[PDB]
Design a protein around this ligand. Sequence first.
Ligand SMILES: NC(=O)C1=CN([C@@H]2O[C@H](COP(=O)(O)OP(=O)(O)OC[C@H]3O[C@@H](n4cnc5c(N)ncnc54)[C@H](O)[C@@H]3O)[C@@H](O)[C@H]2O)C=CC1
Ligand SMILES: NC(=O)C1=CN([C@@H]2O[C@H](COP(=O)(O)OP(=O)(O)OC[C@H]3O[C@@H](n4cnc5c(N)ncnc54)[C@H](O)[C@@H]3O)[C@@H](O)[C@H]2O)C=CC1
Lengths: 255, 255
Amino acid sequence: SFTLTNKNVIFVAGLGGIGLDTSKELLKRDLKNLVILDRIENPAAIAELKAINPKVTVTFYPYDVTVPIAETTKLLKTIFAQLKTVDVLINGAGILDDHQIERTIAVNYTGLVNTTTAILDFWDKRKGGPGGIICNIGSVTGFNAIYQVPVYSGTKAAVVNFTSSLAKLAPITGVTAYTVNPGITRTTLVHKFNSWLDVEPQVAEKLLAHPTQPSLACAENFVKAIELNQNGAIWKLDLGTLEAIQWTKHWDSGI
Amino acid sequence: SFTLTNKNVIFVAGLGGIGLDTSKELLKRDLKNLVILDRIENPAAIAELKAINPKVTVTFYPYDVTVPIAETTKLLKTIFAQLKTVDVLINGAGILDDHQIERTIAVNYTGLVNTTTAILDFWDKRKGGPGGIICNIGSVTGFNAIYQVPVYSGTKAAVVNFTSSLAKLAPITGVTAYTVNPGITRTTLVHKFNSWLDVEPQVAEKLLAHPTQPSLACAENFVKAIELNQNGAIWKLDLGTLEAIQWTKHWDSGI
Ligand SMILES: NC(=O)C1=CN([C@@H]2O[C@H](COP(=O)(O)OP(=O)(O)OC[C@H]3O[C@@H](n4cnc5c(N)ncnc54)[C@H](O)[C@@H]3O)[C@@H](O)[C@H]2O)C=CC1
Ligand SMILES: NC(=O)C1=CN([C@@H]2O[C@H](COP(=O)(O)OP(=O)(O)OC[C@H]3O[C@@H](n4cnc5c(N)ncnc54)[C@H](O)[C@@H]3O)[C@@H](O)[C@H]2O)C=CC1
């Protein structure tokens, strides 16, 4: 059975609203190492995380997912030299700002793809690596968009589809994967944000008038999903529950 | 009832395998103008297109969809100075090469989004424009991936999701939209191509063992879908036919 006990986890975007709560939730278990990679530099959050569980070593490295893949490789080299093995990679970076088209795509899709691609060099069983687990943070918008943020939603559709494909490639690579797709979660991401071409200037207000869940509840279900360790899962973390999507079979390549 | 008669159409990627056949099919109708934008330079094809229908004016402009949006704006300014009005925009650029991660995303999703965003400056009714129609070329891989090209399939998932959102924004912008999503079509795109991290080196050979359709049949159904002019349609152009797809409602924002 899978357990987080004595595991080495890399958490990209571990200091954000959902990230920090998920990091705190993870530290209730006796991981060996929790390595947080983020562009947020918050020494006080790191101090808090180090204080939760004395049995876990918490390390922070500054990281911007939009750098070229060679730079990600350089940092992974440093982290694998420090840890030797990495069991789980959580790719959680995301921005919500449809005024930033290039950056939305670079952070939410390209960066996630590149960190995954870069860690496959250390883990791919075809290269003699040990395999690994990838947990990608998608979004319910990858199933059905928030149409007022069309660019963002399309990036999340890409993450869901890409992750489902990674899971189908597990037999070849040895790396399993799944998405955790939160519903609307109360963080700074959704407190105030820009709709594409300002189609809906009151998008944040309108969205937050409907049901949401706190980041603590999302984090609880995020770690429960990790512990279930189900390759190919399309987990939905909405309104405080943990559910899973049955993706519609519209077409099949035959291969 | 919508008609292509006397319309002005901009077709990005109108000279490729599907593109050129669709351009020929469009010229069976009495368009006012067909403006082909592509990075392919094929003067013989442009002369051939001009000769199909003497009532239509065919103009070619070299164009690479990966340029920054301000460049696309400069080109569109020129086309609107040339023709005054544009009725339909077809975004059809695509590459299939999972060894080119950044370029696959830049061509298949970012470029499409940018051309759409640039033309909205001219068409958005909130900018005093006349509205318009956007036809985006997706792919069946946006419904269900070819998992051996996970980066490409994710880009197409993004196009389908983004286009659906454009259609929901029509009441605000005046710009309607739909995707045409071909199944496997016999063009040079699929004769030989690279899988992500070479997970499947014989991906083209394996895929081509399964059913494919001619690009001419795809083109016939592409123009039929344009003539149906259904805002929000998700068209599947597979095995020589045209069918709508009903997208599953897994989640709803409430707005
Ligand atoms: N809050 C919500 O309603 C939902 C959030 N999501 C996703 O959850 C994840 C976290 O979102 P929240 O915690 O709500 O937002 P947030 O804004 O508090 O956190 C975003 C996280 O991404 C990191 N990040 C952003 N750009 C980065 C870059 N270039 N390099 C490295 N890290 C970068 C931030 O520093 C932070 O760790 C994102 O992937 C978001 O798209 C999914 C669905 C719902
Ligand atoms: N052939 C197939 O099985 C399928 C094709 N598709 C899509 O259909 C479209 C056409 O593909 P095919 O005709 O089969 O392949 P193709 O390789 O013959 O045509 C690709 C087209 O995209 C253009 N393009 C590529 N990069 C560009 C750039 N940077 N700027 C401007 N134009 C650029 C090419 O010059 C050409 O017009 C693409 O969007 C492709 O993803 C969708 C599903 C099935």
